[PDB]
């Protein structure tokens, strides 16, 4: 669920943030998106977007309010590593993958401080 | 989930193996029941049945397998206290409150070694 997402985050980038930091970065960190993402860092929020949408498209889950963010699966952190528990349902365990990917590739991606806070309008 | 429950139950009674201790008790401990239940112990396996049950109807919930116990929700457990977590969602949070009003229960019940592995055919 979001919640879990947000310390994911914080599991595998102690320093940060999560909302502070990856809310409103890019073109496609926070609400929707648009064009295409402007750096790597903005390619992983793209990315989660489509896993999203992927998860949404398996016809066995049916997230509460159509939101899998609403939904909770089970995992951990140990020394900066995500471990994604195997007793997660199907749909449970996709979700957990697309969040548990995505805290990975922020830890890996150049933040830009530029992009934070992007005029979407013009450069989406 | 499954393994959830089985481990607030070994959060409320830490001398517990909870398969074998409350797995095939009673009338209505071990898969689905009937009759009236034998003790308080067995009343509460019923009233988790009948909360599942319950949770199974809440039109917003849909279970994969439709089944109630492949439902991860988050919680924890502190000095055989158990908490469950707000940010669980509405369904989580029914499945949650079901268990462990089951593992309080069950820690509360008198233990009746006569019940365990009953003939249900028969006194059920
Ligand atoms: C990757 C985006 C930021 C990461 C951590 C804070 C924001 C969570 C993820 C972005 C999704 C949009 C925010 C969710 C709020 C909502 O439920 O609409
Ligand atoms: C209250 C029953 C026993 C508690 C701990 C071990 C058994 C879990 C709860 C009983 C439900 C039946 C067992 C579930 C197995 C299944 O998925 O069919
Ligand atoms: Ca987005
Ligand atoms: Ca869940
Ligand atoms: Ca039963």
Request: aromatic content about 12%; some cysteine; glycine content about 4%.
């Given at each position: 669920?979001?919640?879990?997402?947000?310390?994911?985050?914080?599991?595998?980038?102690?320093?940060?943030?999560?909302?502070?930091?990856?809310?409103?970065?890019?073109c496609?960190?926070?609400?929707g998106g648009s064009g295409?993402?402007?750096?790597?860092?903005?390619?992983?929020?793209?990315?989660?977007?489509?896993?999203?949408?992927?998860?949404?498209?398996?016809?066995?889950?049916?997230?509460?309010?159509?939101?899998?963010?609403?939904?909770?699966?089970?995992?951990?952190?140990?020394?900066?590593?995500?471990?994604?528990?195997?007793?997660?349902?199907?749909?449970?365990?996709?979700?957990?993958?697309?969040?548990?990917?995505?805290?990975?590739?922020?830890?890996?991606?150049?933040?830009?401080?530029?992009?934070?806070?992007?005029?979407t309008?013009?450069?989406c």
């Amino acid at each position: 669920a979001l919640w879990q997402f947000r310390s994911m985050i914080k599991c595998a980038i102690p320093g940060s943030h999560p909302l502070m930091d990856f809310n409103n970065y890019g073109c496609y960190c926070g609400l929707g998106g648009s064009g295409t993402p402007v750096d790597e860092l903005d390619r992983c929020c793209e990315t989660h977007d489509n896993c999203y949408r992927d998860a949404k498209n398996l016809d066995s889950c049916k997230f509460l309010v159509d939101n899998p963010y609403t939904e909770s699966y089970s995992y951990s952190c140990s020394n900066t590593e995500i471990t994604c528990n195997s007793k997660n349902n199907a749909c449970e365990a996709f979700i957990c993958n697309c969040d548990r990917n995505a805290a990975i590739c922020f830890s890996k991606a150049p933040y830009n401080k530029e992009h934070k806070n992007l005029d979407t309008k013009k450069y989406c």
